[PDB]
Amino acid sequence: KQYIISEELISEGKWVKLEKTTYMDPTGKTRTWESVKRTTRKEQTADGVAVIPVLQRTLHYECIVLVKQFRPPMGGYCIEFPAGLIDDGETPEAAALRELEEETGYKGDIAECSPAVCMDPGLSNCTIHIVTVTINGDDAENARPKPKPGDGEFVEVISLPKNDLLQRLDALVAEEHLTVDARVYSYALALKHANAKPFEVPFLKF
Template sequence: MKTCPSVGTLFRVSLVTMSTMSNSEEPKVTTAPHIVDEELMAAGKWIKLEKTTYVDPAGNTRTWETVKRTTRQTHIDVDGVGIIALLKRTLHKDCVVMVKQFRPPMGCCSLEFPAGLIDEGETVEVAALRELKEETGFKGEVAGVTPVTCLDPGLSNCTTQIVMVNINGDDMENINPTQQLGDGEFVEVILLPLDEFQSKIDDLMKKEKIVVDAKVYIFAMGMVQAFFKPRELPVLKQ
């Protein structure tokens, strides 16, 4: 003859069941992701490749292939500068000073903001004005500097700061500027009107084989938004 479980037994079984369900529903313990080790795999004059061992938020140990510059200076936590230089001249539209140069990794020319690495002992501002003078011949004044930003965080730890520079195009030294390029440097200076920045870039891309730096195109989209559609969300052409 079977007997029914007592009330006490049912109560204990219920507690065990509730405890099991509660444990199964608890979130997994997470940990702060962090680097464990960095092993050099290959190195050249300008860059190196490392195998990065790290712990992910779930506590798993994983590896990543990381590219780093070998040129970062000891006095600063940024690799280089990019320069958004605005040329202002009487009876002319304000223009953004751009550079076009052949980039071997891309196999073609690219359209970029003037840019360069920071030398030992230089501030970001000094490096920006030096690079602008070398690549374009223009002399300008710093108007602002961004925080340190990353460039391609899925590939590299390379960082940059963008420096805004105003150029007085009516100054004698800026009327016929002379580049100060180093050996092996071939840089073409291109002036693009600020209020037609994106359309002029699109025209260049249609006329010749050229790639555009992502920072440049995002800036161009921002200019379109600021000039013509300040209250609308940007929509890309399909």
């Protein structure tokens, strides 16, 4: 019922651009909105990918591999799922495995890929593909990860136990005073909401 009437560039940098968006509301009226867009965005493609790397080992608990790095806009360190924009002539799945290797050194398998999902709908048009990659830690190819930091890419790898990720994250916060990514937290939260107090839920039924 609603649609975009027009978009006029307000300001543009080398990598990001701010635009004045004009759109038609449900009841005919016309309103404006300030929107953010990346200049690297390709037609019919998402801006980038995010990887949920489940480190697995035989007869051993799983781990979620995350990365910590300084983020200029935050003015401080952040804990995030490995990520990156999708390079030219690259599929989201391909990007996923690449960026995971570049930032962590691990080599994994695509387990599942999501459709394009938005990062901040009210602020930008940025979308990513959330890709779940399973890493075999028993494999010799993963015995000693060899990260490949690009120029300006300083990444600290952090492998956290999955069964109590949310708590590991809060521990990390209280100890280093850094910021957890909203997507990483959502995921951790969900794990707690489904795992925590197994017998507690089917107890009130009685």
